[PDB]
Design a protein around this ligand. Structure first.
Ligand SMILES: Nc1ncnc2c1ncn2[C@@H]1O[C@H](COP(=O)(O)OP(=O)(O)O)[C@@H](O)[C@H]1O
Ligand SMILES: Nc1ncnc2c1ncn2[C@@H]1O[C@H](COP(=O)(O)OP(=O)(O)O)[C@@H](O)[C@H]1O
Ligand SMILES: [Mg+2]
Ligand SMILES: [Mg+2]
Lengths: 371, 81, 293, 186
């Protein structure tokens, strides 16, 4: 009886079998609906395309994300995401395998209630579990203690955990992640005359942000380098055949993570968020958290983030204690890898939320069982 | 060794207040035994150190009471009204 | 996800192709007590019934002297990072001390500032001063004129623009100053004393280690080759730190400043800020001459 | 002297003097060029008609708008619009007169670069300025704060201004205005 690990993040659904090393099904969480007039009769024209089929046929569809800012807004769309990742991607019946699910910290509880109700009534498993994403990101780092900066597509949160105990008062949350970076890149790509307004153009701008953007080490030196000479310019070929060229906007797009005043957010950067989350803890446990900065999520996949993070934390913290940044290359699927580590354990057999516990306590035992 | 030149200027000058090093602290092979700063001496330099370190459209408006920002937003409002 | 006998074989060989720093760091941080290891070693007959963490403790309990052995393995895998942290700090101070030692255009600036400054401090406590501190040179910009339009930094830059046009190539000679502006000498002494204590603890471990009862047990040959390599590299590091302490005491004699009144990091932060203030002062004097044209 | 306010909009150029209640010269910005065969010799046949002269003779002309969606595509046509609104309509000398200009928000910067280059080289004013249109509409409304929905002929933009500060991040631009309504009615 192999379990299933299914990270239903804001960015991409990452689902597969427990005990494995890489997830079997990685696909973006969008629901595409047709907006034009259907003229050809027959041939099986569906009213809703879910998953990669919406990405392939995105030139005639309006795309709706069922998860916005880490909170599941639309529920029938999320049921279509769960039905596609159970019946079509993994091609297994969901009622014979236990399922682990991930959840953001500081969540409203009715999200957990409706997730438990949907997984126990629509896709009624014998057993399930809801886990925190930062605990699974720290479990896949080969350790137990440390602080996780988990930055998905909507939520960037710092959670410090000391000796397996997740401190709740030091959890900090900032609503600035890769969708807002994509929208800021759509805002600053119009400065060169390349207008992008549709939802289908957001995937092209997100591909540009994935392939060409990078985190600078110094902002002013790189801005003076791009203003001095045109050596940092890079070209991109659009799917219709047009070629665009960008300069400083490769590094101004992830500069919002370290300067959140660019899109008008009052809170400070993620290094200051990490510093205030560590400084909310005890004074005796800070030296372990200074050397255990573990990063996760697809937003931390830039090839400049670790040096800038180490320089900003070393400028923030006193120099007597060692500053180390942990950046594994498998951090895109580290939540799924930690879920596959936690699901296969023999100590986890007593921590399952069974069908009889749901029948006794309703869909509310997940608040008192989990953290 | 020799003591340094006790200058007596006519005008009291502004000075930088460093922590001075007396001749009792000086080593044999130091920099300040080998200082030959009297080749840089100039009376013109001391004179400079004494001297330095001792319309078709009428649109300006005098603001005796009001500041710049309050008079600007009033003139915006009075130009609109 | 390694088998437990493979972990024992990597530990007993000191298998350096498999062993990494973070592996041994995570092994020590989750290791239980040796009393718990001996209690797990008493129950080897029920090995199929114990837990996966408990089966790990049965296999690890057979390896003797495990906690000083793993700390010696931890100090071995951290020795390459500890040399690569300590040594470029010492090279950065030594190159900045050697660049400030010869330093003839900046020495002519030091003669010029002392002559102008003793005329300014005449009749004061600092009258007839034989020398002044190099870390005070940031406050040449704070010494303003009577009209508050030029500074003493701006006056000395304009005097070197007029009278002596060879003094101005001093701040490009200061190359290793900004690298030496964040180096603490007490932290270098504490890390080298911790290195000297830990090499003596590994060499005591090496000498108290028994004879190898297995052909796989390559602990005796590999660790003694490490002690021969680490004592050579520490003596290279101790000679370079003694050369660093001699050159700091030589510049302590040369600039006639006390070695205890200022450390290395506030020494060269003020020298790097004097480099940036003088480069601003020449560019402001060139801007003021172009404004007057 | 008296400054010049010349709103170079996408559809209509509105030019006039400073401090006036109404703009003096309101004319559509078109450049008309003939497409048929001119058979009569003499008779003052110009190769281009700018402004109201192209509107009066539009049955034998091809009319090109130099501004499309707030972006000046044809620049020699824009120089012809600027020469017509400086010399023919307003009848001044622009070398001794300041001239303010308007611009849509979220514009490409090289449009402002070429506007600055043309206004400082070909039409060399002593002084000029480039201003946001919604700030001028809120100044004409009299209030200091508020959100302006400004919709000319190509650009429909919502700009909120609080306490005289135009907030950059909440400026929302939609390319749907009166030329799209004209083509939809056609
Ligand atoms: N190489 C990359 N550089 C920059 N951003 C990336 C890169 N790869 C992925 N991303 C961003 O990371 C996001 C995916 O993050 P993900 O881990 O799926 O978050 P979630 O699971 O919360 O949706 C994508 O939206 C993408 O914009
Ligand atoms: N009374 C009206 N009702 C509806 N639309 C109008 C009216 N008057 C003008 N328009 C539209 O407004 C446009 C003129 O807007 P305007 O701001 O003058 O453009 P511009 O200043 O860019 O030339 C015209 O294209 C016309 O379609
Ligand atoms: Mg996620
Ligand atoms: Mg208009």
């Amino acid at each position: 009886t192999t379990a299933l690990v299914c990270d239903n993040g804001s960015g991409l659904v990452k689902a597969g079998f427990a005990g494995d090393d890489a997830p079997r099904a990685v696909f973006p969480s969008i629901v595409g609906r047709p907006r034009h007039q259907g003229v050809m009769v027959g041939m099986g024209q569906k009213d809703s395309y879910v998953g990669d089929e919406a990405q392939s046929k995105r030139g005639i569809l309006t795309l709706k994300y069922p998860i916005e800012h880490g909170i599941i807004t639309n529920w029938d769309d999320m049921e279509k995401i769960w039905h596609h990742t159970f019946y079509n991607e993994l091609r297994v019946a969901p009622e014979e395998h236990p399922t682990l699910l991930t959840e953001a910290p500081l969540n409203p509880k009715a999200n957990r209630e409706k997730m438990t109700q949907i997984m126990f009534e629509t896709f009624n498993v014998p057993a399930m579990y809801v886990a925190i994403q930062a605990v699974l990101s720290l479990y896949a780092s080969g350790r137990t203690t440390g602080i996780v900066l988990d930055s998905g597509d909507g939520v960037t949160h710092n959670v410090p955990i000391y000796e397996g105990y997740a401190l709740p008062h030091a959890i900090m949350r900032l609503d600035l992640a890769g969708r807002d970076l994509t929208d800021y890149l759509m805002k600053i790509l119009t400065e060169r005359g390349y207008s992008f307004v549709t939802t289908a153009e957001r995937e092209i701008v997100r591909d540009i942000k994935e392939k060409l953007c990078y985190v600078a080490l110094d902002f002013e030196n790189e801005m003076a380098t791009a203003a001095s000479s045109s050596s940092l310019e890079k070209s991109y070929e659009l799917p219709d055949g047009q070629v665009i060229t960008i300069g400083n906007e490769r590094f101004r797009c992830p500069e919002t993570l370290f300067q959140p005043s660019f899109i008008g957010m009052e809170s400070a950067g993620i290094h200051e968020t990490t510093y205030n989350s560590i400084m909310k803890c005890d004074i005796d446990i800070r030296k372990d958290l200074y050397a255990n900065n573990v990063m996760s999520g697809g937003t931390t996949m830039y090839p400049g983030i670790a040096d800038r993070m180490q320089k900003e934390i070393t400028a923030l913290a006193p120099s007597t204690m060692k500053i180390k940044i942990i950046a594994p290359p498998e951090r895109k699927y580290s939540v799924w890898i930690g879920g596959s580590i936690l699901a296969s354990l023999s100590t986890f057999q007593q921590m399952w939320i069974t069908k009889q516990e749901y029948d006794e306590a309703g869909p509310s035992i997940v608040h008192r069982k989990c953290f | 060794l020799t003591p340094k030149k006790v200058y007596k200027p006519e005008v009291q000058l502004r000075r930088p207040n460093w922590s001075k090093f007396v001749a009792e602290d000086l080593s044999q092979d130091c920099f300040w035994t080998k200082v030959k700063e009297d080749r840089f001496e100039n009376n013109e330099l001391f004179a400079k150190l004494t001297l330095a370190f001792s319309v078709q459209k009428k649109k300006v408006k005098e603001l005796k009471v009001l500041d710049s920002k309050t008079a600007q937003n009033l003139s915006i409002f009075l130009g609109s009204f | 996800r390694m088998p437990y006998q493979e972990i024992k074989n990597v530990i007993l060989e000191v298998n350096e192709a498999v062993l990494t720093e973070s592996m041994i760091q995570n092994l020590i941080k989750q290791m239980p007590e040796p009393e718990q290891l001996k209690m797990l070693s008493e129950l080897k007959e029920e090995y199929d019934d114990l837990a996966e963490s408990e089966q790990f403790g049965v296999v690890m309990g057979t390896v003797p002297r495990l906690r000083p052995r793993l700390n010696a393995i931890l100090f071995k895998l951290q020795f390459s990072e500890q040399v690569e942290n300590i040594k470029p700090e010492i090279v950065s101070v030594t190159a900045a001390c050697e660049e400030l030692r010869k330093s003839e255009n900046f020495s002519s600036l030091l003669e010029l500032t002392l002559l102008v400054g003793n005329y300014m401090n005449a009749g004061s406590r600092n009258a007839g001063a034989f020398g002044f501190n190099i870390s005070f040179l940031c406050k040449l910009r704070d010494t303003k004129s009577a009209d508050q339009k030029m500074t003493l930094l701006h006056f000395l830059a304009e005097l070197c623009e007029n009278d002596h046009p060879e003094v101005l190539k001093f701040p490009d000679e200061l190359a290793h100053v900004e690298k030496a502006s964040r180096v603490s000498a007490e932290n270098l002494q504490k890390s080298l004393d911790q290195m000297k204590k830990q090499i003596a603890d590994v060499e005591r471990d090496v000498q108290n280690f028994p004879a190898a009862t297995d052909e796989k047990d390559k602990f005796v040959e590999k660790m003694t080759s490490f002690v021969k390599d680490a004592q050579e590299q520490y003596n290279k590091l101790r000679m370079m730190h003694s050369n660093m302490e001699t050159l700091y005491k030589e510049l302590g004699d040369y600039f006639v400043f006390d070695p205890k009144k200022l450390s290395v990091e506030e020494f060269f932060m003020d020298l790097h800020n004097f480099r940036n203030m003088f480069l601003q002062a020449v560019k402001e004097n060139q801007k003021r001459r172009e404004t007057e044209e």
